[PDB]
């Protein structure tokens, strides 16, 4: 969990957006302006990232629920695989508005969802109608899209790992309203005050995004190693 100060350099973490769209609060993590862009200070970046990795690792050791948030279509696919690989669930694209707080109301939704899945190999064969069948399939698809990947939780998650943060400002607001700690790959245009572990990376190119995903994925496996067994053979 000590990603080479050079691997990210090729990944694309250094390239932010332009001044026209630059959060003035991000000044502590600036190195200059290549073609009027804003090159994040990697030297400033790296201690925070590695520190959060350790933080997130001790979490998984205490068996605290983790979570990830879907972003752009490419980001969403990448997030899904890394999450499914281990555990810690994952969002997909919309965050289903006020999931936190309205977690009891969406709990009933999760209940109905799972029942339909179970009844998708039951109710389908018997009493099938050229009308009702389309109803069942379509609704499941919509529900699955976002609710799927969270249905497992069966309770309130104890952590959150979003990306970019700006695209999900809504998610951070609810998390701040409950104490649940969070981590965000803040970029040059993202309000980080609400975050408890500022990862000043770049939600772009996917390449670099895949790096962050791969990194954390590894740290949560160390948590599982403490939850399963130590390295040996």
């Amino acid at each position: 969990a000590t990603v080479s100060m050079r691997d990210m350099l090729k990944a694309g973490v250094h390239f932010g957006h332009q001044t026209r769209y630059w959060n003035p609060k991000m000044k502590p993590f600036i190195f200059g302006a290549r073609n009027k862009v804003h090159i994040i200070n990697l030297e400033k970046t790296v201690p925070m990232f590695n520190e959060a990795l350790a933080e997130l690792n001790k979490i998984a050791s205490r068996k605290g629920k983790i979570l990830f948030v879907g972003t752009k279509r490419a980001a969403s696919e990448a997030v899904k695989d890394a999450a499914l690989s281990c555990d810690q669930f994952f969002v997909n694209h919309r965050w289903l508005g006020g999931m936190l707080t309205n977690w009891k109301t969406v709990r009933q939704s999760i209940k109905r969802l799972k029942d339909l899945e179970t009844q998708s190999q039951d109710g389908t064969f018997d009493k099938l109608t050229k009308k009702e069948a389309l109803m069942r399939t379509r609704e499941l698809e919509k529900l699955e899209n976002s609710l799927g990947g969270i249905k497992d939780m069966g309770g309130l998650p104890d952590a959150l790992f979003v990306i970019d943060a700006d695209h999900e400002h809504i998610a951070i607001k609810e998390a701040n309203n409950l104490g649940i700690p969070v981590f965000a790959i803040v970029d040059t245009n993202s309000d980080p005050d609400g975050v408890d572990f500022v990862i000043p990376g770049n939600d772009d190119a996917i390449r670099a995004v895949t790096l962050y995903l791969g990194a954390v994925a590894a740290t949560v496996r160390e948590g599982r190693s403490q939850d399963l067994a130590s390295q040996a053979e």
Partner: peptide
Amino acid sequence: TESFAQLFE
């Protein structure tokens, strides 16, 4: 693009 290390030097 030039390496960050050389640029920072």
